[PDB]
Amino acid sequence: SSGPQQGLRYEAETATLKGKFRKKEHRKQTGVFFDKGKGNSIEWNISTGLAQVYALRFKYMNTTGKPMPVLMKFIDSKGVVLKEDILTFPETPDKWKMMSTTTGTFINAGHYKVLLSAENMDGLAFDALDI
Ligand SMILES: [Ca+2]
Ligand SMILES: [Cl-]
Ligand SMILES: [Cl-]
């Protein structure tokens, strides 16, 4: 039960990217497409104002034919892990879809990191994070 959305988009392709991936356009959107390997991650850096629980909405594709578990960490500016959760991204057709979670905890104004990683991210693509 989050607070009101802010109407802000943070593009995946200008987030902090690690591992093996490609930036590609698909159906007019630019996304980060992850490949094989154990060291892949995407980390958005967001700055929040008024204090609330935040909904986090990921625009993504999962072209693998199976649900894909991904570890989410919500991290504060000093490296404190405020939330750790497995998100399961359902398989999608070759079209961008949305997956929502929350910060779980009430967060005050500050700079935060939304980190997604998994042992396997092959076949996941991310367009953006909306808050
Ligand atoms: Ca994008
Ligand atoms: Cl966990
Ligand atoms: Cl689409």
Author numbering: 11 to 141
What do the authors of the reporting publication say about this deposited model?
The crystal structure of BT0996-C with the N-terminal His-tag was determined at 1.65 Å resolution by molecular replacement using, as phasing model, the preliminary 2.3 Å resolution structure of the C-terminal His-tag construct, solved by Se-SAD. The final refined high-resolution structure contained one molecule of BT0996-C in the asymmetric unit, consisting of 122 amino acid residues of the wild-type protein and an additional nine residues of the N-terminal tag. BT0996-C displays a distorted β-sandwich, composed of two β-sheets connected by loops. β-Sheet A includes β-strands 1, 3, 4, 11, 6 and 9, whereas β-sheet B comprises β-strands 2, 5, 10, 7 and 8. The structural calcium ion, highly conserved in many lectins and CBM families, is positioned near β-1, β-11 strands and H1 helix. This metal ion is coordinated by Glu21 Oε1, Glu23 Oε1 and Oε2, Asp137 Oδ1, the backbone carbonyls of Asp137, Thr40, and one water molecule, in an octahedral geometry confirmed by the Check My Metal server. A striking feature of BT0996-C is its high content in positively charged residues (15 Lys, 2 His and 4 Arg), representing almost 20 % of the protein composition, resulting in a theoretical isoelectric point (pI) of 9.43. This feature confers a prominent broad positive patch to the electrostatic surface of the BT0996-C protein, which includes both β-sheets and the loops that connect them. Instead, in the 3D structure here reported, a 2-methyl-2,4-pentanediol (MPD) molecule present in the crystallisation solution could be modelled, establishing CH–π interactions to His36 and water-mediated hydrogen bonds to Gly133 O and Thr73 Oγ1 from β-sheets 3 and 4, near the loop region.
